[model samples]
Target: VAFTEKQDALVSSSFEAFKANIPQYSVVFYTSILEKAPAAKDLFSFLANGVDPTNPKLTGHAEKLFALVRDSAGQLKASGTVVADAALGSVHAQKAVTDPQFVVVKEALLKTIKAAVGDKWSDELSRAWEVAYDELAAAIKKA
Candidate 1:
Protein backbone atom coordinates (compact mmCIF):
# COMPACT_ATOMS: atom_id res chain seq x y z
CA VAL A 1 0.00 0.00 0.00
CA ALA A 2 1.09 3.56 -0.65
CA PHE A 3 2.20 5.45 2.46
CA THR A 4 -0.61 7.88 3.23
CA GLU A 5 -0.65 11.44 4.54
CA LYS A 6 -2.14 10.28 7.83
CA GLN A 7 0.71 7.84 8.25
CA ASP A 8 3.13 10.64 7.60
CA ALA A 9 1.68 12.60 10.52
CA LEU A 10 1.74 9.48 12.67
CA VAL A 11 5.41 8.93 11.91
CA SER A 12 6.37 12.57 12.41
CA SER A 13 4.42 13.12 15.60
CA SER A 14 5.50 9.87 17.15
CA PHE A 15 9.05 10.70 16.19
CA GLU A 16 8.74 14.09 17.83
CA ALA A 17 7.63 12.37 21.01
CA PHE A 18 10.38 9.85 20.46
CA LYS A 19 12.94 12.61 20.09
CA ALA A 20 11.78 14.14 23.34
CA ASN A 21 13.13 11.14 25.16
CA ILE A 22 16.37 11.36 23.23
CA PRO A 23 19.30 9.51 24.82
CA GLN A 24 16.96 7.18 26.65
CA TYR A 25 15.11 6.04 23.55
CA SER A 26 18.37 6.04 21.66
CA VAL A 27 19.81 3.64 24.21
CA VAL A 28 16.94 1.28 23.59
CA PHE A 29 17.18 1.51 19.79
CA TYR A 30 20.94 1.03 19.49
CA THR A 31 21.15 -1.65 22.14
CA SER A 32 18.44 -3.70 20.50
CA ILE A 33 20.24 -3.44 17.17
CA LEU A 34 23.57 -4.51 18.60
CA GLU A 35 22.09 -7.33 20.64
CA LYS A 36 20.21 -8.57 17.61
CA ALA A 37 23.19 -8.24 15.29
CA PRO A 38 26.45 -8.52 17.14
CA ALA A 39 28.48 -8.42 13.95
CA ALA A 40 27.28 -4.86 13.50
CA LYS A 41 29.29 -3.80 16.51
CA ASP A 42 32.41 -3.16 14.49
CA LEU A 43 30.44 -1.30 11.87
CA PHE A 44 30.54 1.88 14.00
CA SER A 45 33.73 3.77 14.67
CA PHE A 46 32.63 4.98 18.12
CA LEU A 47 32.30 1.40 19.27
CA ALA A 48 35.21 -0.16 17.44
CA ASN A 49 36.50 -1.28 20.80
CA GLY A 50 33.26 -2.73 22.15
CA VAL A 51 29.47 -2.60 22.28
CA ASP A 52 28.02 -0.13 24.77
CA PRO A 53 24.91 1.66 23.69
CA THR A 54 24.68 3.38 27.07
CA ASN A 55 27.54 5.70 26.24
CA PRO A 56 26.57 9.31 26.96
CA LYS A 57 27.63 10.62 23.56
CA LEU A 58 25.08 8.46 21.77
CA THR A 59 22.31 11.08 21.97
CA GLY A 60 24.13 13.38 19.55
CA HIS A 61 24.72 10.55 17.13
CA ALA A 62 21.14 9.39 17.51
CA GLU A 63 19.97 12.93 16.79
CA LYS A 64 21.81 12.88 13.47
CA LEU A 65 20.47 9.44 12.63
CA PHE A 66 16.91 10.45 13.48
CA ALA A 67 17.29 13.58 11.37
CA LEU A 68 17.88 11.32 8.39
CA VAL A 69 14.82 9.30 9.31
CA ARG A 70 12.73 12.44 9.76
CA ASP A 71 13.64 13.72 6.31
CA SER A 72 13.11 10.34 4.69
CA ALA A 73 9.66 10.02 6.22
CA GLY A 74 8.84 13.49 4.96
CA GLN A 75 9.74 12.51 1.42
CA LEU A 76 7.79 9.24 1.59
CA LYS A 77 4.64 11.19 2.24
CA ALA A 78 2.51 12.09 -0.80
CA SER A 79 3.46 8.44 -1.29
CA GLY A 80 6.49 9.11 -3.49
CA THR A 81 9.89 7.43 -3.37
CA VAL A 82 12.77 5.27 -4.89
CA VAL A 83 14.70 8.43 -5.09
CA ALA A 84 14.31 11.33 -2.85
CA ASP A 85 16.99 9.13 -1.35
CA ALA A 86 18.05 9.97 2.21
CA ALA A 87 21.64 10.89 2.83
CA LEU A 88 23.44 7.74 3.83
CA GLY A 89 26.67 8.32 5.70
CA SER A 90 30.01 6.89 4.66
CA VAL A 91 29.50 3.95 7.03
CA HIS A 92 27.40 2.08 4.48
CA ALA A 93 30.07 2.32 1.81
CA GLN A 94 33.03 1.53 4.06
CA LYS A 95 31.50 -0.98 6.46
CA ALA A 96 29.81 -4.20 5.50
CA VAL A 97 26.34 -3.01 6.50
CA THR A 98 24.25 -6.11 5.88
CA ASP A 99 20.58 -6.48 5.04
CA PRO A 100 19.96 -8.46 8.20
CA GLN A 101 21.61 -5.70 10.14
CA PHE A 102 19.16 -3.29 8.59
CA VAL A 103 16.47 -5.76 9.64
CA VAL A 104 17.79 -5.53 13.17
CA VAL A 105 17.76 -1.74 12.93
CA LYS A 106 14.17 -1.77 11.73
CA GLU A 107 13.08 -4.04 14.53
CA ALA A 108 14.77 -1.82 17.05
CA LEU A 109 13.05 1.22 15.57
CA LEU A 110 9.59 -0.40 15.62
CA LYS A 111 10.01 -1.37 19.22
CA THR A 112 11.15 2.11 20.11
CA ILE A 113 8.33 3.69 18.14
CA LYS A 114 5.87 1.58 20.04
CA ALA A 115 7.44 2.64 23.27
CA ALA A 116 7.27 6.30 22.37
CA VAL A 117 3.80 6.44 20.84
CA GLY A 118 2.08 4.64 23.72
CA ASP A 119 -1.77 4.83 23.42
CA LYS A 120 -1.61 6.04 19.81
CA TRP A 121 0.03 2.87 18.51
CA SER A 122 -1.73 0.80 15.86
CA ASP A 123 -1.04 -1.51 12.93
CA GLU A 124 -1.58 1.39 10.56
CA LEU A 125 1.00 3.45 12.39
CA SER A 126 3.32 0.45 12.33
CA ARG A 127 2.85 0.04 8.61
CA ALA A 128 3.58 3.71 8.11
CA TRP A 129 6.95 3.46 9.82
CA GLU A 130 7.78 0.15 8.17
CA VAL A 131 7.16 1.66 4.77
CA ALA A 132 9.19 4.73 5.62
CA TYR A 133 12.17 2.76 6.91
CA ASP A 134 12.11 0.32 4.01
CA GLU A 135 12.42 3.26 1.65
CA LEU A 136 15.41 4.39 3.67
CA ALA A 137 16.95 0.90 3.51
CA ALA A 138 16.54 0.71 -0.23
CA ALA A 139 17.97 4.19 -0.60
CA ILE A 140 20.92 3.30 1.56
CA LYS A 141 21.57 0.13 -0.40
CA LYS A 142 21.52 1.96 -3.71
CA ALA A 143 24.37 4.24 -2.59
Candidate 2:
Protein backbone atom coordinates (compact mmCIF):
# COMPACT_ATOMS: atom_id res chain seq x y z
CA VAL A 1 0.00 0.00 0.00
CA ALA A 2 0.90 3.69 -0.33
CA PHE A 3 1.36 6.32 2.31
CA THR A 4 -0.79 9.37 2.89
CA GLU A 5 0.73 12.74 3.73
CA LYS A 6 0.19 12.48 7.46
CA GLN A 7 1.15 8.84 7.52
CA ASP A 8 4.11 9.63 5.39
CA ALA A 9 5.09 12.28 7.87
CA LEU A 10 4.61 9.81 10.67
CA VAL A 11 6.68 7.12 8.98
CA SER A 12 9.47 9.46 8.04
CA SER A 13 9.55 11.03 11.46
CA SER A 14 9.28 7.68 13.17
CA PHE A 15 12.05 6.28 11.02
CA GLU A 16 14.14 9.28 11.89
CA ALA A 17 13.37 8.93 15.56
CA PHE A 18 14.06 5.24 15.34
CA LYS A 19 17.35 6.06 13.77
CA ALA A 20 18.15 8.53 16.48
CA ASN A 21 17.19 6.03 19.12
CA ILE A 22 19.10 3.21 17.54
CA PRO A 23 20.93 4.38 14.50
CA GLN A 24 22.70 1.16 13.70
CA TYR A 25 19.63 -0.94 14.29
CA SER A 26 17.50 1.33 12.13
CA VAL A 27 19.93 1.04 9.28
CA VAL A 28 20.15 -2.69 9.78
CA PHE A 29 16.36 -3.17 9.84
CA TYR A 30 15.82 -1.18 6.66
CA THR A 31 18.64 -3.04 5.07
CA SER A 32 17.17 -6.30 6.25
CA ILE A 33 13.74 -5.49 4.86
CA LEU A 34 15.24 -4.49 1.56
CA GLU A 35 17.27 -7.67 1.38
CA LYS A 36 14.04 -9.59 1.71
CA ALA A 37 11.98 -7.37 -0.59
CA PRO A 38 13.94 -5.31 -3.04
CA ALA A 39 10.79 -4.68 -5.03
CA ALA A 40 9.73 -2.81 -1.95
CA LYS A 41 12.18 -0.10 -2.89
CA ASP A 42 9.26 2.26 -3.19
CA LEU A 43 7.88 1.32 0.22
CA PHE A 44 11.23 1.66 1.94
CA SER A 45 11.96 4.94 0.20
CA PHE A 46 8.70 6.34 1.44
CA LEU A 47 9.57 4.93 4.84
CA ALA A 48 12.88 6.74 4.80
CA ASN A 49 12.11 10.06 3.14
CA GLY A 50 8.33 10.33 3.21
CA VAL A 51 8.45 11.80 -0.28
CA ASP A 52 7.16 10.57 -3.59
CA PRO A 53 9.26 7.56 -4.60
CA THR A 54 9.97 8.88 -8.07
CA ASN A 55 11.36 12.09 -6.73
CA PRO A 56 14.97 12.61 -7.79
CA LYS A 57 16.12 12.99 -4.21
CA LEU A 58 14.86 9.51 -3.44
CA THR A 59 16.12 7.75 -6.54
CA GLY A 60 19.76 7.60 -5.55
CA HIS A 61 19.09 6.59 -2.00
CA ALA A 62 16.66 3.99 -3.17
CA GLU A 63 19.21 2.50 -5.48
CA LYS A 64 21.79 2.52 -2.77
CA LEU A 65 19.38 0.78 -0.46
CA PHE A 66 18.50 -1.70 -3.18
CA ALA A 67 22.10 -2.62 -3.75
CA LEU A 68 22.77 -2.92 -0.08
CA VAL A 69 19.84 -5.25 0.37
CA ARG A 70 20.45 -7.25 -2.75
CA ASP A 71 23.95 -7.99 -1.66
CA SER A 72 22.96 -8.76 1.89
CA ALA A 73 19.89 -10.80 0.99
CA GLY A 74 21.83 -14.03 1.07
CA GLN A 75 23.18 -13.39 4.51
CA LEU A 76 20.01 -11.89 5.91
CA LYS A 77 17.95 -14.72 4.55
CA ALA A 78 20.28 -17.57 5.32
CA SER A 79 21.05 -16.53 8.83
CA GLY A 80 18.31 -14.14 9.89
CA THR A 81 21.15 -12.62 11.83
CA VAL A 82 20.13 -9.09 11.02
CA VAL A 83 16.72 -9.68 12.50
CA ALA A 84 15.54 -13.16 13.16
CA ASP A 85 11.92 -14.01 12.53
CA ALA A 86 10.84 -15.01 16.04
CA ALA A 87 12.98 -12.35 17.65
CA LEU A 88 11.65 -9.65 15.36
CA GLY A 89 8.09 -10.60 16.20
CA SER A 90 9.07 -10.63 19.83
CA VAL A 91 10.44 -7.13 19.48
CA HIS A 92 7.22 -6.00 17.88
CA ALA A 93 5.30 -7.65 20.69
CA GLN A 94 7.37 -5.83 23.27
CA LYS A 95 6.79 -2.59 21.42
CA ALA A 96 3.09 -3.24 21.49
CA VAL A 97 3.34 -2.48 25.16
CA THR A 98 6.48 -0.43 25.73
CA ASP A 99 6.03 1.52 22.55
CA PRO A 100 2.53 2.11 21.29
CA GLN A 101 3.93 3.99 18.31
CA PHE A 102 5.33 0.72 17.10
CA VAL A 103 1.81 -0.44 16.41
CA VAL A 104 0.95 3.03 15.18
CA VAL A 105 3.38 2.63 12.32
CA LYS A 106 1.32 -0.02 10.56
CA GLU A 107 -2.04 0.69 12.24
CA ALA A 108 -1.88 4.37 11.42
CA LEU A 109 -0.92 3.53 7.92
CA LEU A 110 -3.94 1.26 7.55
CA LYS A 111 -6.12 3.88 9.20
CA THR A 112 -4.93 6.45 6.72
CA ILE A 113 -5.95 4.18 3.90
CA LYS A 114 -9.28 3.41 5.55
CA ALA A 115 -10.00 7.12 5.74
CA ALA A 116 -9.21 7.48 2.08
CA VAL A 117 -10.96 4.33 0.90
CA GLY A 118 -13.75 3.84 3.43
CA ASP A 119 -13.88 0.99 5.97
CA LYS A 120 -11.69 -1.48 4.10
CA TRP A 121 -8.68 -0.96 6.35
CA SER A 122 -8.95 -4.26 8.14
CA ASP A 123 -9.14 -6.27 4.96
CA GLU A 124 -6.34 -4.27 3.43
CA LEU A 125 -4.05 -4.47 6.45
CA SER A 126 -4.79 -8.13 6.85
CA ARG A 127 -3.70 -8.74 3.31
CA ALA A 128 -0.71 -6.46 3.68
CA TRP A 129 0.39 -8.14 6.86
CA GLU A 130 -0.16 -11.52 5.32
CA VAL A 131 2.20 -10.62 2.55
CA ALA A 132 4.66 -9.32 5.10
CA TYR A 133 4.56 -12.52 7.14
CA ASP A 134 4.83 -14.59 4.03
CA GLU A 135 7.90 -12.76 2.93
CA LEU A 136 9.60 -13.03 6.29
CA ALA A 137 8.44 -16.58 6.72
CA ALA A 138 9.83 -17.47 3.35
CA ALA A 139 13.13 -16.00 4.30
CA ILE A 140 13.20 -17.99 7.49
CA LYS A 141 11.99 -21.08 5.75
CA LYS A 142 14.82 -20.80 3.30
CA ALA A 143 17.21 -20.62 6.18
Candidate 3:
Protein backbone atom coordinates (compact mmCIF):
# COMPACT_ATOMS: atom_id res chain seq x y z
CA VAL A 1 0.00 0.00 0.00
CA ALA A 2 2.46 2.56 -1.17
CA PHE A 3 1.02 6.04 -0.72
CA THR A 4 0.92 8.40 -3.68
CA GLU A 5 2.38 11.85 -3.17
CA LYS A 6 -1.08 13.27 -2.56
CA GLN A 7 -1.93 10.52 -0.08
CA ASP A 8 1.35 11.05 1.68
CA ALA A 9 0.74 14.73 2.05
CA LEU A 10 -2.76 14.20 3.33
CA VAL A 11 -1.72 11.53 5.77
CA SER A 12 1.16 13.59 7.09
CA SER A 13 -0.93 16.68 7.61
CA SER A 14 -3.81 14.79 9.16
CA PHE A 15 -1.46 12.99 11.51
CA GLU A 16 -0.03 16.32 12.55
CA ALA A 17 -3.52 17.46 13.43
CA PHE A 18 -4.15 14.21 15.22
CA LYS A 19 -0.88 14.43 17.16
CA ALA A 20 -1.60 17.93 18.29
CA ASN A 21 -4.53 16.63 20.29
CA ILE A 22 -3.12 13.37 21.59
CA PRO A 23 -5.11 13.31 24.82
CA GLN A 24 -8.42 13.76 23.07
CA TYR A 25 -7.55 11.51 20.14
CA SER A 26 -6.30 8.73 22.37
CA VAL A 27 -9.49 8.82 24.38
CA VAL A 28 -11.51 8.65 21.18
CA PHE A 29 -9.47 5.68 19.95
CA TYR A 30 -9.66 3.62 23.13
CA THR A 31 -13.26 4.49 23.77
CA SER A 32 -14.16 3.42 20.26
CA ILE A 33 -12.29 0.15 20.70
CA LEU A 34 -14.07 -0.55 23.96
CA GLU A 35 -17.42 0.27 22.41
CA LYS A 36 -16.76 -2.19 19.61
CA ALA A 37 -15.22 -4.88 21.78
CA PRO A 38 -16.07 -4.73 25.44
CA ALA A 39 -13.93 -7.76 26.08
CA ALA A 40 -10.86 -5.80 25.14
CA LYS A 41 -11.19 -3.73 28.25
CA ASP A 42 -9.53 -6.56 30.12
CA LEU A 43 -6.39 -6.43 28.01
CA PHE A 44 -5.04 -3.28 29.56
CA SER A 45 -5.58 -4.17 33.18
CA PHE A 46 -1.87 -4.47 33.56
CA LEU A 47 -1.60 -0.76 33.00
CA ALA A 48 -3.40 -0.22 36.27
CA ASN A 49 -5.45 -2.07 38.87
CA GLY A 50 -8.34 -1.98 36.43
CA VAL A 51 -8.93 -1.27 32.72
CA ASP A 52 -10.22 2.28 32.85
CA PRO A 53 -9.16 4.05 29.66
CA THR A 54 -9.02 7.36 31.51
CA ASN A 55 -6.41 6.08 33.89
CA PRO A 56 -3.16 7.90 33.45
CA LYS A 57 -1.39 4.60 32.89
CA LEU A 58 -3.73 3.62 30.11
CA THR A 59 -3.62 7.09 28.57
CA GLY A 60 0.15 6.90 28.59
CA HIS A 61 -0.07 3.56 26.85
CA ALA A 62 -2.32 5.07 24.21
CA GLU A 63 0.17 7.86 23.73
CA LYS A 64 2.87 5.30 22.98
CA LEU A 65 0.61 3.59 20.46
CA PHE A 66 -0.10 6.82 18.58
CA ALA A 67 3.59 7.60 18.60
CA LEU A 68 4.26 4.20 17.08
CA VAL A 69 1.66 4.80 14.40
CA ARG A 70 3.17 8.21 13.64
CA ASP A 71 6.65 6.72 13.36
CA SER A 72 5.47 3.66 11.44
CA ALA A 73 3.79 5.80 8.81
CA GLY A 74 7.12 7.38 7.99
CA GLN A 75 8.90 4.02 7.96
CA LEU A 76 6.23 2.63 5.65
CA LYS A 77 6.89 5.42 3.17
CA ALA A 78 10.48 4.17 3.02
CA SER A 79 9.31 0.53 2.73
CA GLY A 80 10.59 -0.37 6.18
CA THR A 81 9.34 -2.32 9.15
CA VAL A 82 6.50 -0.58 10.91
CA VAL A 83 7.12 -1.92 14.39
CA ALA A 84 9.52 -4.44 15.80
CA ASP A 85 8.04 -7.87 16.46
CA ALA A 86 9.26 -8.04 20.04
CA ALA A 87 7.82 -4.65 20.89
CA LEU A 88 4.24 -5.61 20.06
CA GLY A 89 4.47 -9.39 20.04
CA SER A 90 5.16 -10.07 23.69
CA VAL A 91 2.48 -7.65 24.85
CA HIS A 92 -0.07 -9.06 22.45
CA ALA A 93 0.79 -12.60 23.42
CA GLN A 94 0.36 -11.80 27.08
CA LYS A 95 -2.93 -10.02 26.52
CA ALA A 96 -4.20 -12.73 24.14
CA VAL A 97 -6.30 -10.34 22.05
CA THR A 98 -7.17 -12.66 19.16
CA ASP A 99 -6.82 -11.81 15.48
CA PRO A 100 -10.55 -11.18 15.09
CA GLN A 101 -10.35 -8.77 17.98
CA PHE A 102 -7.42 -7.09 16.31
CA VAL A 103 -9.53 -6.45 13.22
CA VAL A 104 -12.20 -4.78 15.32
CA VAL A 105 -9.64 -2.75 17.21
CA LYS A 106 -8.01 -1.68 13.99
CA GLU A 107 -11.34 -0.57 12.62
CA ALA A 108 -11.97 1.45 15.77
CA LEU A 109 -8.59 3.08 15.42
CA LEU A 110 -9.16 4.01 11.76
CA LYS A 111 -12.61 5.33 12.52
CA THR A 112 -11.30 7.30 15.46
CA ILE A 113 -8.53 8.78 13.36
CA LYS A 114 -10.99 9.73 10.65
CA ALA A 115 -13.20 11.45 13.17
CA ALA A 116 -10.29 13.18 14.77
CA VAL A 117 -9.03 14.45 11.44
CA GLY A 118 -12.57 15.54 10.54
CA ASP A 119 -12.74 17.25 7.13
CA LYS A 120 -9.22 16.17 6.30
CA TRP A 121 -10.33 12.56 6.20
CA SER A 122 -10.49 11.23 2.66
CA ASP A 123 -10.54 7.87 0.96
CA GLU A 124 -6.81 8.07 0.38
CA LEU A 125 -6.02 8.89 4.00
CA SER A 126 -8.32 6.12 5.15
CA ARG A 127 -6.70 3.64 2.78
CA ALA A 128 -3.25 4.70 3.86
CA TRP A 129 -4.12 4.04 7.53
CA GLU A 130 -5.73 0.71 6.69
CA VAL A 131 -2.55 -0.45 4.99
CA ALA A 132 -0.41 0.82 7.84
CA TYR A 133 -2.51 -1.06 10.40
CA ASP A 134 -2.65 -4.18 8.24
CA GLU A 135 1.11 -4.37 8.30
CA LEU A 136 1.16 -3.99 12.08
CA ALA A 137 -1.49 -6.68 12.47
CA ALA A 138 0.43 -9.15 10.30
CA ALA A 139 3.57 -8.54 12.28
CA ILE A 140 1.76 -9.15 15.57
CA LYS A 141 0.15 -12.34 14.26
CA LYS A 142 3.49 -13.73 13.11
CA ALA A 143 5.02 -12.83 16.44
Candidate 4:
Protein backbone atom coordinates (compact mmCIF):
# COMPACT_ATOMS: atom_id res chain seq x y z
CA VAL A 1 0.00 0.00 0.00
CA ALA A 2 2.16 2.75 -1.30
CA PHE A 3 0.95 6.18 -0.28
CA THR A 4 1.07 9.18 -2.52
CA GLU A 5 3.42 11.94 -1.41
CA LYS A 6 0.35 14.03 -0.63
CA GLN A 7 -1.07 11.26 1.53
CA ASP A 8 2.21 10.89 3.36
CA ALA A 9 2.32 14.59 4.07
CA LEU A 10 -1.23 14.61 5.38
CA VAL A 11 -0.60 11.68 7.69
CA SER A 12 2.68 13.08 9.01
CA SER A 13 1.30 16.55 9.68
CA SER A 14 -1.90 15.21 11.26
CA PHE A 15 0.09 12.89 13.51
CA GLU A 16 2.02 15.88 14.83
CA ALA A 17 -1.26 17.61 15.58
CA PHE A 18 -2.52 14.43 17.22
CA LYS A 19 0.54 14.13 19.43
CA ALA A 20 0.16 17.75 20.51
CA ASN A 21 -3.32 16.97 21.81
CA ILE A 22 -3.10 13.43 23.18
CA PRO A 23 -5.28 14.18 26.19
CA GLN A 24 -8.13 15.57 24.17
CA TYR A 25 -7.42 13.03 21.45
CA SER A 26 -7.69 10.17 23.90
CA VAL A 27 -11.05 11.36 25.15
CA VAL A 28 -12.45 11.73 21.70
CA PHE A 29 -10.88 8.48 20.50
CA TYR A 30 -12.19 6.41 23.41
CA THR A 31 -15.58 8.12 23.39
CA SER A 32 -15.92 7.50 19.68
CA ILE A 33 -14.89 3.88 20.17
CA LEU A 34 -17.57 3.41 22.82
CA GLU A 35 -20.16 4.97 20.55
CA LYS A 36 -19.20 2.57 17.78
CA ALA A 37 -18.69 -0.50 19.96
CA PRO A 38 -20.41 -0.09 23.27
CA ALA A 39 -19.86 -3.76 24.00
CA ALA A 40 -16.13 -3.13 24.29
CA LYS A 41 -16.43 -0.69 27.17
CA ASP A 42 -16.05 -3.49 29.66
CA LEU A 43 -12.54 -4.04 28.40
CA PHE A 44 -11.57 -0.65 29.78
CA SER A 45 -13.22 -0.98 33.20
CA PHE A 46 -9.85 -0.57 34.89
CA LEU A 47 -9.82 3.10 34.05
CA ALA A 48 -10.91 4.27 37.47
CA ASN A 49 -13.66 1.71 37.32
CA GLY A 50 -14.20 3.10 33.85
CA VAL A 51 -15.32 6.52 35.09
CA ASP A 52 -12.44 8.80 35.90
CA PRO A 53 -11.03 10.61 32.92
CA THR A 54 -7.76 11.40 34.69
CA ASN A 55 -7.11 7.87 35.81
CA PRO A 56 -3.66 6.61 34.98
CA LYS A 57 -5.24 3.86 32.94
CA LEU A 58 -6.98 6.36 30.74
CA THR A 59 -4.17 8.88 30.41
CA GLY A 60 -1.49 6.28 30.24
CA HIS A 61 -3.33 4.27 27.66
CA ALA A 62 -3.87 7.39 25.62
CA GLU A 63 -0.23 8.33 25.82
CA LYS A 64 0.86 4.90 24.72
CA LEU A 65 -1.67 4.81 21.93
CA PHE A 66 -0.70 8.22 20.62
CA ALA A 67 2.96 7.38 20.87
CA LEU A 68 2.48 4.12 19.03
CA VAL A 69 0.59 5.89 16.31
CA ARG A 70 3.29 8.51 16.00
CA ASP A 71 5.97 5.90 15.94
CA SER A 72 4.16 3.81 13.37
CA ALA A 73 3.58 6.78 11.12
CA GLY A 74 7.18 7.78 11.53
CA GLN A 75 8.28 4.30 10.51
CA LEU A 76 5.48 3.63 8.04
CA LYS A 77 7.66 4.24 5.02
CA ALA A 78 10.02 1.59 6.31
CA SER A 79 7.90 -0.88 8.31
CA GLY A 80 4.46 -0.78 6.72
CA THR A 81 3.00 -1.73 10.07
CA VAL A 82 1.85 0.38 13.01
CA VAL A 83 2.47 -1.95 15.93
CA ALA A 84 4.15 -5.28 16.27
CA ASP A 85 1.94 -8.36 16.13
CA ALA A 86 2.67 -9.39 19.69
CA ALA A 87 1.82 -5.99 21.05
CA LEU A 88 -1.50 -5.72 19.23
CA GLY A 89 -2.42 -9.23 20.26
CA SER A 90 -1.60 -8.46 23.86
CA VAL A 91 -3.73 -5.33 23.83
CA HIS A 92 -6.74 -7.07 22.30
CA ALA A 93 -6.39 -10.41 24.04
CA GLN A 94 -8.62 -9.77 27.05
CA LYS A 95 -11.13 -7.84 25.01
CA ALA A 96 -11.61 -10.46 22.30
CA VAL A 97 -11.98 -7.67 19.79
CA THR A 98 -12.93 -9.01 16.38
CA ASP A 99 -11.74 -7.79 13.01
CA PRO A 100 -14.95 -5.86 12.49
CA GLN A 101 -14.37 -4.18 15.82
CA PHE A 102 -10.92 -3.21 14.63
CA VAL A 103 -12.51 -1.53 11.67
CA VAL A 104 -14.83 0.32 14.02
CA VAL A 105 -11.89 1.41 16.09
CA LYS A 106 -10.13 2.68 13.00
CA GLU A 107 -13.18 4.67 12.01
CA ALA A 108 -13.41 6.09 15.50
CA LEU A 109 -9.74 7.00 15.37
CA LEU A 110 -10.26 8.80 12.07
CA LYS A 111 -13.14 10.70 13.56
CA THR A 112 -10.95 11.71 16.46
CA ILE A 113 -8.26 12.86 14.07
CA LYS A 114 -10.73 14.84 12.02
CA ALA A 115 -12.10 16.55 15.10
CA ALA A 116 -8.59 17.38 16.20
CA VAL A 117 -7.54 18.59 12.78
CA GLY A 118 -10.50 20.99 12.60
CA ASP A 119 -10.90 22.88 9.32
CA LYS A 120 -7.82 21.23 7.88
CA TRP A 121 -9.60 17.91 7.54
CA SER A 122 -10.43 17.09 3.95
CA ASP A 123 -11.39 14.14 1.80
CA GLU A 124 -7.80 13.64 0.74
CA LEU A 125 -6.70 13.63 4.36
CA SER A 126 -9.46 11.23 5.24
CA ARG A 127 -8.40 8.93 2.41
CA ALA A 128 -4.82 9.00 3.61
CA TRP A 129 -5.85 8.04 7.12
CA GLU A 130 -8.12 5.31 5.82
CA VAL A 131 -5.34 3.75 3.83
CA ALA A 132 -2.87 4.00 6.67
CA TYR A 133 -5.31 2.61 9.21
CA ASP A 134 -6.36 -0.20 6.92
CA GLU A 135 -2.75 -1.23 6.61
CA LEU A 136 -2.41 -1.18 10.37
CA ALA A 137 -5.53 -3.29 10.76
CA ALA A 138 -4.18 -5.92 8.41
CA ALA A 139 -0.95 -6.06 10.34
CA ILE A 140 -2.86 -6.46 13.61
CA LYS A 141 -5.03 -9.22 12.24
CA LYS A 142 -2.14 -11.10 10.77
CA ALA A 143 -0.31 -10.81 14.06
lDDT of 3 at 30: 73
TM of each candidate vs. truth: 0.83, 0.23, 0.80, 0.80
lDDT of 3 at 25: 78
lDDT of each: 0.75, 0.37, 0.69, 0.71
Candidate 4, residue 20: lDDT: 86
Candidate 2 has a TM-score of 0.23
Ordered list by TM-score, greatest first: 1, 3, 4, 2
Tens digit of lDDT per residue, candidate 4, span 32-114? 77777776666677432433566657767766665565455555666554655597756665546687887887787788789
Q: Whose lDDT is higher: candidate 1's or candidate 2's?
A: 1
Can you write out model 3's per-residue Cα lDDT over 1-143, one digit (the tens) per residue? Answer: 46455655665777777778877777777777767777665566643333454577756776676656655666677775665558677777754577778788778778767877888777778887777777767767667
- Write model 2 residue lDDT over 47-79, tens digit each, in one string: 454334344544455333322323233333344
Model 3 whole-model lDDT (C-alpha atoms): 0.69
Q: Which sections of candidate 3 miss by over 4 Å?
A: 46-54, 80-85
Write one digit per residue (lDDT tens) for candidate 1, span 1-143.
37677878888998898888886788777777777876666666655555455566677777776667767778877548735334454447655777767788888888888888898889988887888888877777876
TM-score: the better of candidates 1 and 4: 1
Ranking by lDDT: 1, 4, 3, 2
Query: How much lDDT does candidate 4 score?
Result: 0.71
Candidate 1 deviant stretches above 4 angstroms:
48-56, 82-90
C-alpha RMSD of each candidate structure in angstroms: 2.6, 15.0, 2.8, 2.6
Sequence-dependent TM-score of model 4: 0.80
